[PDB]
Design a protein around this nucleic acid. Structure first.
Ligand SMILES: [Mg+2]
Lengths: 29, 70, 172
RNA sequence: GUCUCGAGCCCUAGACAGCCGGGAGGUGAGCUUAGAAGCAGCUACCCUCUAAGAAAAGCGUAACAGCUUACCGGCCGAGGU
């Protein structure tokens, strides 16, 4: 589990409240 | 329409030629109030949304010429 | 190993011994696929290439048989197209199809015509300065296309100056 | 060439490869110079936009242009190095 992928998911979940795989992962949250 | 960045620095400095070695040899000088005037001019040339980041693109040419900010 | 290949609706393929015949609207192609312990069979509407062995040599051929069958599927439907362009510098070259053989006359100023025989069901059509080789069997078409380029081979003089000859323009 | 055994690293949060798409602005960096604009040479090698994108890795031009490399995205899908 790479550290930049964890930081990117937490950056996408931040722009939902306010790669296509990293978007799906962030939407499931 | 608006002339290049290299020319706008040499107008409000008084110097024409740069240096033999940038950052290592200081030639010209600027101030904070003088960079805030060059930030108002370039609107379609720069991709920056705010005026805050628009100044950084001008400073990103200055320190690599021989210009010290006071 | 076992690789299953789904046969297209336009295509229907029969098999006897080591020979596989593939029929379609653009024609028919019969090939022989023979290698140690590799069994190629038709299971209803799928082609099965299988072997009990998993060594590099056996694996090389299973993968070769796959591409051979997939190419036969494409040949009997859409066909195979090779495009060529006849270029000349000083001497006007006369390319013409005379029977089951393509003849090139007055090449580089030669009095004697250069000729090659067309491989099987392959059709060679000419429209002025362009040549288009086509047919169902890629083996036959690829070779006939190659034969035309190889026909203007020049070993005696510099190729960079004497550039005359039909060259492959389009590869499928 | 092929067989066998071990080690490290990467991978379904999609690896290796291939193909498609993107490969952006400040600015053609500065000095040199008639000119040099990624790419003759010297020094620096900075920050915006952003999912990426070098003060440019390789060709290419008189110099541009032009072609890709880095780098990011997509298609694909299982091992790969
Ligand atoms: Mg000689």
């Amino acid at each position: 589990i790479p550290e930049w992928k964890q930081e990117e998911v937490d950056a996408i979940v931040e722009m939902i409240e306010s790669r296509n795989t990293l978007l799906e992962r962030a939407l499931d949250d | 329409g608006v002339p290049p960045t290299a020319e706008l620095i040499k107008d409000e400095a008084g110097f024409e030629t740069g240096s033999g070695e940038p950052q290592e040899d200081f030639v010209a000088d600027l101030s904070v109030d003088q960079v805030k005037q060059i930030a108002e001019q370039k609107h379609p040339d720069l991709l920056s949304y705010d005026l805050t980041n628009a100044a950084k693109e001008v400073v990103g040419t200055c320190t690599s010429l021989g210009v010290t900010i006071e | 190993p076992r690789v299953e290949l789904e046969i297209p609706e336009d295509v229907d393929a029969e098999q006897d011994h080591l020979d596989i015949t593939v029929e379609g609207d653009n024609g028919s192609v019969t090939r022989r696929l023979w290698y140690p312990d590799i069994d190629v069979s038709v299971d209803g509407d799928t082609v099965v290439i299988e072997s009990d062995e998993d060594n590099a040599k056996t694996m090389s051929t299973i993968g070769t048989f796959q591409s051979h069958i997939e190419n036969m599927f494409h040949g009997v439907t859409e066909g195979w197209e090779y495009g060529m362009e006849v270029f000349y510098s000083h001497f006007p070259m006369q390319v013409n199809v005379e029977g089951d053989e393509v003849v090139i006359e007055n090449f580089l100023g030669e009095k004697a015509p250069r000729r090659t025989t067309i491989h099987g069901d392959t059709d060679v059509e000419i429209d002025g300065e362009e040549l288009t080789v086509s047919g169902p069997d890629i083996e036959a078409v690829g070779q006939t296309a190659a034969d035309i380029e190889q026909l203007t081979r020049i070993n005696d003089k510099d190729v960079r100056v004497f550039q005359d000859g039909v060259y492959i323009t389009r590869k499928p």
